[PDB]
Design a protein around this ligand. Sequence first.
Ligand SMILES: COC(=O)[C@H](Cc1ccccc1)NC(=O)[C@@H](N)CC(=O)O
Ligand SMILES: COC(=O)[C@H](Cc1ccccc1)NC(=O)[C@@H](N)CC(=O)O
Lengths: 216, 216
Amino acid sequence: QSALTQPPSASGSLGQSVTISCTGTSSDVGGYNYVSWYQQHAGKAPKVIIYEVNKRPSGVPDRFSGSKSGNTASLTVSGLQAEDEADYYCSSYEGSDNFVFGTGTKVTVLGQPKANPTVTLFPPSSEELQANKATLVCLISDFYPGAVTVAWKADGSPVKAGVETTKPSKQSNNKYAASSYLSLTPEQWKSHRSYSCQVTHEGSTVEKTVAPTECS
Amino acid sequence: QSALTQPPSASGSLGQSVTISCTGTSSDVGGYNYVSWYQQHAGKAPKVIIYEVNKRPSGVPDRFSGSKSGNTASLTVSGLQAEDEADYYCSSYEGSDNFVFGTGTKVTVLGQPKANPTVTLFPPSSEELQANKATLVCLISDFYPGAVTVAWKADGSPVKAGVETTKPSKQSNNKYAASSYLSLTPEQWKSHRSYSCQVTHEGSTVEKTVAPTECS
Ligand SMILES: COC(=O)[C@H](Cc1ccccc1)NC(=O)[C@@H](N)CC(=O)O
Ligand SMILES: COC(=O)[C@H](Cc1ccccc1)NC(=O)[C@@H](N)CC(=O)O
């Protein structure tokens, strides 16, 4: 019926350790030894890092370890790293082949070094302009925290109009990425001098420009 | 690792009957009758919706069926109810360590017409190769539901590492558009026949190839 009361948040520090614990009743959790832990990364397939309460599949490292106490098991992670930022779930065998999960926890490894973005501007394909099209993409990546402001200007004065930015998403490196594209026209692209993309991240503005190259 | 595989998106309207797949071939023993189907709404904890190919726990409406087709675990949400729009995972238990998890299928009760992705592959601008670096940006715009799958190949052969994908973000036209990039040294760049990016999205599989002919 109900889930296994799991806290909604935790916080650790690079090298430290954090114990995420979920609780239930003496019917599902409290009765057996099948309290397992999952871990999916921000809207992405789950993964198992614990089973039979205190155990791990031949992949999860030695920082992962949970153990059942009362009617509540609990996982803890030391050697805390940035890549550990994620939502964890707790399961537990119920009655008639029934399995129950926790209410979820989102652990945030604090103390994570701050990064300034790396803006890469791109000129329309050698083939984009062949189909009578032209769109520029401002690749903002490798930055942290996860908030940024992307802006576009024409030959010098604002261009805001026909610009689509996307939310910032974590990468494989535990930092963020994010693009922003402009849709021009070969003609709305040629009849100019230089377009530029501006990325303001934590009081640190970056700004690359672009000009037409004949070849690619 | 992602042995089990499934559509990026599977959508329909009310009444319809979407049919998610779990074609986790990867050959396997081709005899793992333990396939589960976790349903994961947004902002909530997953939950076994079907288990053992086709067994259903207490609760689950008959609207759901489960089955293995040679090497294909499928699920069907006939009469697609509104409250059925979520992410639908799938799995097979292996070696008590290998809990392989599908990749996730996000159902969507159609809210607007279907919009296929508009991928445009970008090569590293000359000025960038003038900084001893290459970045290939794959821009995917104008689609729906907001669920895409991106693959990378260098010379036809997959590019399993160095690739980055963003998370679908609604555009001003409420049409999703994500972006994927692959960072590589000018050498890797120049040392390959042609580079290709190819997103997935409900049947269609548009792929764009880019050759390293650059001006620098
Ligand atoms: C997979 O565990 C089992 O084989 C089944 C339960 C089950 C099977 C398939 C899907 C959900 C639940 N049996 C068990 O887990 C039991 N061996 C353990 C217990 O009674 O606590
Ligand atoms: C029915 O719920 C299950 O499948 C669970 C957990 C699980 C998690 C992720 C992927 C597959 C299985 N599986 C089981 O209980 C069994 N596969 C393990 C056992 O028999 O002890």
